[PDB]
Symmetry: C3
Subunit: 221 residues, 3 copies
């Protein structure tokens, strides 16, 4: 079941990438860079999850799905870039604020991988550093980045706020599931955690980019 679910994930990621490619042919005032980012995220995630389907992306008395971290270390910074470029749509880019989010995010993902390889108290030291990183990313998202979106007009700011809430809501689920599942307290079963880390990324990657790009295309008229 685990293998079949991961094949199904990869196929949906492929269809997502094709959809974003088609949209890019009629860009409706959205820069090509934003279409490219929306295509890379699902293609990279699909390839990583494919490695799990074929039984290569994990190792073993607990099973670590390391391919998830290889996915997230590329896909999550690109998602924060898409969010930041949304706030900055039609105005000056602030690359310092963008790269601050990339730096925080990559650290967050590495702390999670190390936490998964750790035993005892040490696991929860690393986990905690990752959570603090996520908190600061959320403060930036709803503080200075939202202020940039407001400075680009009410229509843009409204779309930014919607996409920020969408992403923020899905992102807090990852560390929660991690903690309740085998990697943490083990209150939830392996099969449960797998279903969560199949369904969340579908909404997190393909869903987010549909909502994000349609909103920006609608500002062309």
């Amino acid at each position: 079941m685990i293998s079949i679910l991961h094949y199904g994930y990869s196929f949906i990621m492929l269809l997502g990438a094709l959809y974003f490619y088609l949209l890019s042919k009629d860009p409706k005032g959205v820069p090509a860079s934003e279409y490219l980012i929306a295509m890379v995220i699902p293609l990279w995630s699909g390839a990583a999850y494919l490695s799990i389907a074929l039984g290569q992306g994990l190792f073993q008395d607990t099973t670590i799905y390391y391919a998830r971290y290889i996915d997230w270390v590329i896909s999550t910074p690109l998602l924060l870039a898409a969010l930041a470029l949304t706030a900055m749509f039609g105005g000056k880019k602030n690359l310092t604020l963008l790269f601050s989010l990339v730096a925080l995010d990559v650290f967050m993902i590495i702390t999670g991988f190390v936490a998964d390889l750790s035993i005892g108290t040490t696991k929860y030291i690393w986990y905690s550093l990752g959570v603090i990183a996520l908190i600061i990313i959320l403060v930036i998202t709803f503080g200075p980045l939202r202020r940039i979106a407001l400075s680009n007009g009410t229509r843009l700011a409204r779309h930014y706020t919607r996409v920020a809430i969408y992403l923020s809501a899905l992102w807090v689920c990852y560390p929660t599931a991690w903690l309740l599942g085998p990697s943490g307290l083990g209150l939830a079963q392996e099969l449960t955690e797998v279903l969560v880390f199949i369904i969340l990324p579908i909404f997190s990657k393909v869903g987010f980019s549909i909502v994000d790009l349609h909103g920006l295309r609608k500002l062309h008229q």
Copy 2:
């Protein structure tokens, strides 16, 4: 023999880098970035192949030898080669960084699929191999499609030089997956020693040769 051939490779790469450094002192209207890229490619490749000569850049997986240092080489050197090609098409005009980074993304994936294919057994090997080939096909479509159209927009002389260098690179690049498949990593029709000679001779033309043809053409547009 295998060790000595890799020492010889590294020494030729060093001489290549020194030659490009000298050329950079009299740049003849070619930006410094293009000289830097031409120097990094052979220096990085030389260091990787040196690790093979010293017997560090390989290990034994079941009954086969994996030359993993090749992948450490190619993951840096091949994206820089596609950048040099893209900057050639864009010479005297606006840079399109989105198209450049699309080629880098495709290329890095292509090289990773090859490394994983080399570590795989049975059908799984050929799934990864196949994904890498599709990546290479899309790179070739970009090279002869949108990137060639950018070269045309920068004038007849430049477009002619671009087309020559693109064919040169395209011809050498299709040899890598072919050799991979016929050698030990694939069907095993060719011996280890054969594959080694191929992955010594091809990179010399692919790295140092390509950059000589590429840079001399661009320097000739100054006069």
Copy 3:
């Protein structure tokens, strides 16, 4: 003692990052990018050294201890330090990103050669070590040659500050390969505990100290 010293290091790095964050709120004409670089360096180094304190960032290779977390630290922190230096020379003038990326390329290679040297036995160790030293020499040539000439082109006050920071960095940086060679990784004339103290004290001056001297100088060109 080794574990306690690494906790103390991480805590000092945290306080360094906080100080640079406060300074960034009243930037005094220094771009936000230079404050961000000064914050990333100590935070990344602190996290790496924390992994040593918890006993995860090292392993036993043959009969010696490799502190591999140091290399994970330096491969991110040292290129960012050379970037801060380069941006100091270029303060109030055109950025030369080709010269900046040349320093990053040299530096990353230098750090990788060190990691491979630490994993090597016999002559091979000293081949890799030597390639890293040559990289450091070329970085020093750039620092006191073309990069210092850019600083002079941005005026006497800036050039004076650049020269001070360049000497400060150059002085600390030559200590790393010296200590490496005298300690367990090399000839073994110095004890593990000695080497540890050196690779706790030097980075404090190398990271937090350098950025204090660097940023205060640039802020003073505003007053």
